[PDB]
Structure of Enoyl-CoA delta isomerase 2, mitochondrial:
Amino acid sequence: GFETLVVTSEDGITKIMFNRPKKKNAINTEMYHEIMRALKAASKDDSIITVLTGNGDYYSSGNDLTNFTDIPPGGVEEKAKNNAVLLREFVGCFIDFPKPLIAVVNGPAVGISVTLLGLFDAVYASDRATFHTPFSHLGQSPEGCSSYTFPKIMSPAKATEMLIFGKKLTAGEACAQGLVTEVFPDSTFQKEVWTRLKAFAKLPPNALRISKEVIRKREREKLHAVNAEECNVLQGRWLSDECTNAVV
Amino acid sequence: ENLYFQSMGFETLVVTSEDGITKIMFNRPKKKNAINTEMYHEIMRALKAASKDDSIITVLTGNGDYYSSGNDLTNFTDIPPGGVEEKAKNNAVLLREFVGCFIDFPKPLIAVVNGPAVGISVTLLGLFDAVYASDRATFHTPFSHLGQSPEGCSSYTFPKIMSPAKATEMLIFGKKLTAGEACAQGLVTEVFPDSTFQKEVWTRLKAFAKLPPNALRISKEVIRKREREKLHAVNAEECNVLQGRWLSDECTNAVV
Amino acid sequence: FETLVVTSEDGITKIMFNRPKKKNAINTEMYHEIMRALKAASKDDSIITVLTGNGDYYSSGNDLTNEEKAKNNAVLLREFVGCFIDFPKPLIAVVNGPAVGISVTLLGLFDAVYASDRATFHTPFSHLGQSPEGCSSYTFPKIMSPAKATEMLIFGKKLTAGEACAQGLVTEVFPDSTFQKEVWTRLKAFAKLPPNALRISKEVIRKREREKLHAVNAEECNVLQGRWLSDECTNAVV
Ligand SMILES: [Cl-]
Ligand SMILES: [Cl-]
Ligand SMILES: [Cl-]
């Protein structure tokens, strides 16, 4: 039983739903932990496929900034390391996920919830979805392996505008630039998507798991290495002059 | 060894060389150019020949309405005295050797896709230098439907070429693409209307052949050399995995 | 600067090719001046750095008014390219018009690239009996896809800005009349962003790739030095 997610599994599909609609599905410390437990569970269950999606109008507003409790006794420094270790571990869960992993993007997405899409196997989006990684505005560096994946996926010219200059994309833009697999009209979104997924689940289980493994195994060591770099850099930025300023 | 004069004769292929262009055509139109065991061998000999001849450029293309229906499933003779196990190793070794011929081909290599393409015939496009398609061409790699894993180096090339989000739908979930879709996703260089296809393409290729031969060969060599070791590794991994799949519960089932 | 105009304003260093009479062709001096200009912009107080051409042209590429000669040019080219590999701040191309040769290939190392609709991109190395450079042998296949990079690098096709944008070289295209306006507005905004964040973001993206790119550059230059001494290259130059 989870406090920030709703996890179901049926028809060979495990469905992980973000469930803090009141906060636009902001990811707080607890949800970081719960999403890992959930993914650990889905990796071992009898699902063919695993899906992430958001409850309500938002996919996710990304990392919850109420995580500025700042209360740890060891002040910013302890907090920054702890967050960095947590972030590393969290991203690693996506790098290692052995079964097909699919994002059903119901609405706007932000931050870590967008950068992790670079590690998904497919990504289906409503037309009222948008994609935004404004790390620079907050005096921060990129994460979720996006420093590596996004230039390869989008081309460097297009990735820059999004990661460095913090541009916001529409779903059509994100689909054209290779983040998003396909876009559907919002009124028919859920229907068209789940139909498609129900079909995919009827395909030969081990062929799907093994196909992905052949695609992903050789790249995981690189991605882990990117993740580690990204998180050390970020731990610095969190201690920074500019980051502190920028958050306001 | 394998020098030939104007044209080399084969049972499943037509191989000509003219205007500094060697042209390898699949010739089992009756079977939608399905690639049987013999054609695997013949395509290798043909490539070995084109690598050594005086062509500037090399082309693959199909005879008739199809580019290729991919691997011929009449290759379910199953007759080898050693059963499925011997058959599965033998096919793995062959596939490895075959794919490697594409990895190592030293001159510009171009696919002229006259019509539908399937399976190994599509995955190898990730190793071509250019790929020109008729609008009635389609591209399909349904390995999962057959309980199989990816090959042709597509496990590595297709995510880099198409982006993971787009490669997945084609390799894992077996979607079929139109030539417009394949062009947009980077597999295909360009699409032409079917009625003017042959004309526009061969004009373009006759021009390219007039370019400085060694510049072309060396340009490609600079682009390709550093990546061959990796591709050969991918190919080996893919074929070991596939050998397992061919022995599988699911694959056997899925084929029927 | 004899061949360039270098200004720095609003946290933006702007390096303009200035040989409009020669379609901004890049001669032996400009190679050196561009290096000094970058070394400067890397150290100054600009947030961003921009290249652009004066007049109608971005650059006609290496000025053909240019054994000892072939090694010297190889060493220079290697050193020049490296300056683009190593540039630590955001680096942006404002392509006012036609671009050619080295001036295009380097775009693979830029962070963003904005183009007027009367810009075109052309790398006809094969026509001149030459091999690729600017790290394009590595970057262009990855950016465009092998099937699209080949037609441009090996077969020397010329692209429109729309085509280049679709294939990933170019960030965006603007109508020529509004080009300068729209771009500089956009750049002025970017400059207002947190300076260190921007620098460090790029550093995280680029650092791990630099060693590779430098190796590519070296390999490209040794090959090219051979081509410069070639049967075919001499001929082709006519
Ligand atoms: Cl965190
Ligand atoms: Cl086979
Ligand atoms: Cl030079």
